[model samples]
Target chain A: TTGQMPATSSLVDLLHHPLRWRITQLLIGRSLTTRELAELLPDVATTTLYRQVGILVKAGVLMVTAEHQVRGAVERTYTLNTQAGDADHDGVDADRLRTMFTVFVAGVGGHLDQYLEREQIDPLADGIAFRQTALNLSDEELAEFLTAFGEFLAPYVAHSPAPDRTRRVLSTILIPD
Target chain B: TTGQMPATSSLVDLLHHPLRWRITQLLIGRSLTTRELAELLPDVATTTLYRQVGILVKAGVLMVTAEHQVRGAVERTYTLNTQAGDADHDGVDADRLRTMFTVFVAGVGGHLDQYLEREQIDPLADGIAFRQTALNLSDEELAEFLTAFGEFLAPYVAHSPAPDRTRRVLSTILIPD
Candidate 1:
């Protein structure tokens, strides 16, 4: 079955910047206001941060979920427009796919850098792990394996944040040889 | 518990090169002679490839597993020296870890590029997937989750290559926030 190509160039263009990518990643599975984003990304000037957030919202990659009255001003909370950002593999060309993949990889590397730069990070104690293994599986088996794996992780994926639960990023890549 | 730091500088230095990193990744879970490597990595000149192989051997990141006489020359089969390449997290400093992680991320990206460049490739059919999700887990829960994941994948990891079994690389990264 064939489907129309997704208009992902704008999404890619918007997220290719370092600051914008960080903002999108930060909003994954959560919503945050500009003030919260400023606190989390202290290095970016407040003006620059607000401008980027506005750009993302204008581009439809981010949606304003709510607004608040903060000291006689309106504060907007934003969440990722997941469908706009999600490039479903229907009609993507190789060149565009390559660009998207490169951006994704850079984002992952950037997050790792952020984690590593933190003071007193004990990777072993924090359960930090990065490794790759080659598996031999038929196409049928591969589909089944991924489905089962998804089912297994469903409970954990549904868990809400708590005092005892620290946030961790799990990045996965499966490439055929 | 304190232990001597791993002398991983040389390993990182050696594998940081594009060609060397590709070679190391190709050698994972398999052994290949120089001739075979040349066949697989056709873009590289054979002389340059042989030199890099020798360098990796000298650095002890690769070991000569077998020697075969081919056309009046000794053809050496090489496999990754798992010990030297496996940076056990006992005494690794943050700087070295970052470098190692950078190299690893680059290698994965390179492999993805290779996969995408292939003619008539269908990612959906092949089950190629790349994504990141944030999970909430305590330190103890993270450990338990990883152990369970490892146990769940053990059978698949132990499978031997077969005609119906296509080789696929599964790369994973877990970073605490």
Candidate 2:
């Protein structure tokens, strides 16, 4: 859910940028106007926010859901266009992939930073684990390994956000050795 | 789960056909070989199945996961490539949309056929209901209504296939009145 970009086919293009992807993560399940977005992400310049917002809206990732008259100007609210976001397609540049990965890693680092800042931190109590292993496999073995991984992740990934379940952020990295 | 085709950007072009769409449905969570595919869809000729299956495989919806020796030849098992399927994108033509709708309607009709075949039919016992009503709403009202519906469904959608939960099929239709 946090990783979702605009529903546009050019989602990779839209989300490859850090600021735009951050904006998307902010609007994942909630609707926010341009004004609200600026307030939430004060770090981003207003001009950049509006320009990127314009692109997302056109790309169909950010949709104008409502409009209101405020101080004789228009306030437009937007939500992630999920129907399109949930469909499958391609044409993402490698650059965008790297950008998204950068965002993901940055988010993880931010969370870890907060965790470490706390006076009392219990890794076991919190069910936290950070470990890695090296694997050697043939091209033939790699397909099954990844497919198995996908199958393992399927049930957990099948559901949308739910109150009954505790939310946990999961990240995985696989690179050629 | 059954609706995913390959992850090609030309998804609409790949899935706009009845047979291809049907293949996608068949391959949703299950992996099967071309022989099994031909068997599942006896209506399609072997030549045609190979040709169409080739298209889906090329499109990236169907992926070859394994191979075995069969009668001195190789047999390939295929499954739906879901990463692409799960990412929302666009470019579905009217033709593909119509084909998908046709498949859905036919599936509904087939279910009804099976239901009618039963010697004792009890709608209440079976929890069967096929009904419709009319409504009026402005663009603003419609957006709110849809958002509410999505929010309401979120909790249930968040959970994967659970032992505590019973399986249910839900479908919704919205059109201009």
Candidate 3:
């Protein structure tokens, strides 16, 4: 997690934008064709999504894993090249870090868009909450607080998906505020 | 991270309450004494803080890792007994999982309290945001999305505190909408 940084400037650029970010996310666990990606992200114009995917392909961040002829067209399937991006914190630049955080926002926002469309959610029972408050913490105290927070989360974070475990998403945004 | 679970029910009970949850979070990255913990959590009364710490220690969630004499007081330090809790997914019960989620709510609320009290915060530049939405996904799609999310976050989660990486908190709650 530390001492590793972005592999290429282009990778950072590809990841910085929301459309490509969403595309990369969709490709994480499995390979999918352009048509499938377009279906998954219907709000994005198919042309725009294909263009972004093209950029990632040229940059080698997304690989054309397989291709086949479908109805007289070449249907392309792609997967994320995990080795190419800044997942490893090798030599993190500030700009790259900024890009990374923005991608995080895109991630949460995309999931939330779907959540908001559903009906009959009892916020209270569901533990649905969205809140923010500023902390006036000294350097030492801030360090301490963050460390504690990380430790409290480490256990679940360490585990893979399990039948008994409910999937929960924990997102925190800390900027100048 | 998988195959590990809490050994004691008392551990869950200790972590279920908000004040103690706050205390456990503070102790995550490093260990601290009642004096230091009280200083970090000033709003909590010294007596109340001590009571919470006592419960943790008795439940085997916190252990006295070190100790020394402070004037007439025996100043002792504690670290989380990771084995006592279900940091691993060994055998997490529904109730224990419930406690876990509630504890997460407490964590976000604690960090947020400070965010709100601050004099000024540029929400956009500061990267402060909280919004909820429902996503309509079939069972298979939901599984794929959650697995993808976990894989997306695994790298950052594996690392401890680092200089190159800025600390960001992410909190999300997913339920039937």
Candidate 4:
């Protein structure tokens, strides 16, 4: 992964804010219009949401892949843009990705902690959580680890704002594990 | 990762207000005494930085891996505590992260962009950027795309307050390229 990307980008920029990150996670997998995303995330105003999306677009972090009329009104949808990795046309950077992956994972940890606190869920009350994992691996195993890990996380990639589905992906990664 | 983290006796928390995220980035791969990290990132107060580190350590985002005496004073070294992807250890919500990521990324961008603008960089003439890249990908590719693509951004992660090293990392990612 580091091999493909240039050194000018990072996942840190994609995440860091509570609202925008949450929206990004939600938008993944399925495309949602601004109103739907806004509805799911209550705190952000419609205008701010649009502005946020514009900024990401400017940065090439997210994309408006589709925009068409639905119910006689224009609607737009976005996807995670790939070139933003700061990679050139020829190849990619696995090392840089590993780093971004670290940030993304740890970021999830941070957000998850906050969600727990907001819900007042004592992390230790029978179902409480606060643990780390470790793993030893070979090169093949590491690649497998990366692939498998991504598969493992694919379901959770999109953060749905539906109260029934909204969740915090904040978590820390013990790299080796 | 949708599982909950177990009760680990001691883990550092990284989500301190205002500057915690930035603090962690500065500490990655290189452990730093609070004083050192504070010194690198200008505009932050020493007292506030120390408080942020303390909170992070308390929550388990960092570890007091080492310490040394400086001028007869004991200064502790801190390192990031990674928790490999444990879909189980619920920390932050996926949807929430999307929201937060957008804001945080934009917020950081705002800081860098403002700095560059005031400093009088010619984005158009100099070709220094606040630009977006475009690409196409399959569902299976998004993860890889994000991984490979993130690397190109390393050059401008955090700008220096110093004149010589002061540079910005700004890029947007969108699909339909």
Top-DockQ structure, candidate number: 1
What does candidate 1's lDDT look like per residue over A18-42, in tens digits? 8888888887777889999999998
Please tell me which model should have the higher DockQ, number 2 or number 3: 3
Over 4 Å off, model 4 = A1-19, A82-110, A113-130, A150-177, B1-177
**Model number 3 iRMSD:** 12.0
lDDT of 1 at A8: 80
What digit string (tens of lDDT, one per residue) describes model 3 on residues B87-148?
Answer: 43434444444454455555555555555555654333344333222233444545665566
Worst 10 residues of 1 chain B by lDDT: B1-10
Error of 1 at B69 (Å): 7.9
Model 1: lDDT equals: 0.77
The Cα error of candidate 1 at residue B83, in Å, is: 2.6
Consecutive 10-residue window with the lowest summed lDDT within model 4 chain B: B1-10
lDDT of 4 by residue, B73-152 (tens): 88899876655223333444434333434434433433333334334332222222221111223433444544443342
lDDT of 2 by residue, A28-102 (tens): 545789988888667679989989899888887778899999999988999877765644424333333344334
Candidate 3 local lDDT, A1-177, one digit each (tens) = 111123356676666676776777566535788888889888889899889889888888888889989999888899877666534344444444545544555555555455445454333333333322233343454555556645544443454544544334444444321
Question: Which candidate gets the maximum TM-score versus the true structure?
Answer: 1
TM-score of 2: 0.33
Query: Each candidate's TM vs. the true structure?
Result: 0.81, 0.33, 0.44, 0.40
| Residue runs of model 2 more than 4 Å from their true location after superposition | A1-177, B1-9, B88-177
> Candidate 3 regions off by >4 Å?
A1-7, A86-89, A93-95, A120-177, B1-24, B29-31, B37-70, B73-177
